[PDB]
Design a protein around this ligand. Structure first.
Ligand SMILES: COc1cc(/C=C/C(=O)O)ccc1O
Length: 283
């Protein structure tokens, strides 16, 4: 059913999507040991999950003061939105992982290292993504079907993941957080451009769908960064990812709160993972 729009507008999921869906994906609490010690995450598997099929995977980071359980807690209930959207055909089934930047030496800034070395191999060796194996080569070869996003400090995590993990991840969803690398917006954009240059990727091989609220403090620093990025040849601004690769959704009146941010995921996540996808779809 999904069709790309060129300037998608903010629309909250219906209130009914916040209540439990009978077609509920399974949420599995996992514990693993990596460079930052023994840590946990949650894995959302779509309803009907079949390990002999291959699923898109989206990693989603919490904000400051939160943890790996926040996004699927009663304070957010993202799984209800996912369940309803997948059941209604709005969102193709995918795996959603909620890790944490807490623990050991880990920070929102440096999480990408643990992500690369420990999180991807742990999750993707257990569950069925497009990664045929979880060697660096197997992960890189499946990058078009892997995404990363996050809220606030988790948005910062997302930007650091982008600049350090373009080889492994093609889709990025920074929510209400800017990239802290640089003394000006131009420095931030230039850093991203340099990462893209180093990666060798074409503009059809990475995608950024940023979002925030018009009354969300993150707008103050996101907006200048987005404008600087728009000026780069590396980005073609439009939400139609069949045509371009960069969009910034600003929700009128929304404030810095998961109550709103969950809806940004509802609006944006359906836009991910169709470019170079393996099914024959018309979007
Ligand atoms: C990474 O960018 C941002 C982070 C925050 C974090 C707020 C908090 O932890 O309370 C707020 C605005 C931002 O633009």
């Amino acid at each position: 059913s999904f069709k790309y729009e060129s300037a998608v507008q903010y629309r909250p999921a219906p209130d009914s999507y916040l209540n439990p869906c009978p077609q509920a994906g399974r949420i599995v609490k996992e514990t693993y040991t990596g460079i930052n010690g023994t840590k946990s995450l949650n894995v959302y598997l779509p309803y009907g999950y079949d390990p002999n099929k291959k699923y898109n995977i989206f990693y989603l980071m919490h904000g400051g003061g939160e943890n790996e359980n926040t996004i699927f807690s009663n304070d957010v209930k993202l799984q209800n939105i996912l369940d309803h959207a997948i059941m209604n055909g709005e969102l193709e089934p995918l795996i959603v992982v909620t890790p944490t930047f807490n623990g050991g030496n880990c920070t929102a800034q440096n999480f990408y290292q643990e992500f690369r070395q420990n999180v991807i191999p742990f999750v993707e060796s257990k569950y069925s993504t497009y990664a045929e194996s979880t060697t660096p080569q197997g992960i890189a070869a499946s990058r078009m079907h892997r995404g990363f996003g996050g809220f606030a400090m988790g948005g910062l995590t997302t930007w650091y993941v982008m600049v350090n993990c373009l080889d492994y991840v093609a889709y990025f969803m920074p929510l209400s957080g800017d990239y802290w690398y640089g003394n000006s917006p131009q420095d931030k954009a230039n850093s991203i451009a340099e990462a893209i240059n180093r990666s060798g990727l074409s503009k059809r091989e990475y995608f950024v769908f940023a979002a925030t609220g018009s009354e969300d403090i993150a707008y103050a620093n996101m907006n200048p960064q987005i404008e600087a990025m728009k000026a780069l040849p590396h980005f073609d601004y439009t939400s139609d990812f069949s045509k371009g690769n960069f969009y910034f959704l600003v929700a009128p009146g929304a404030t810095h709160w998961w109550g709103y941010v969950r809806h940004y995921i509802y609006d944006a996540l359906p836009y991910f993972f169709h470019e170079l996808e393996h099914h024959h779809h018309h979007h």
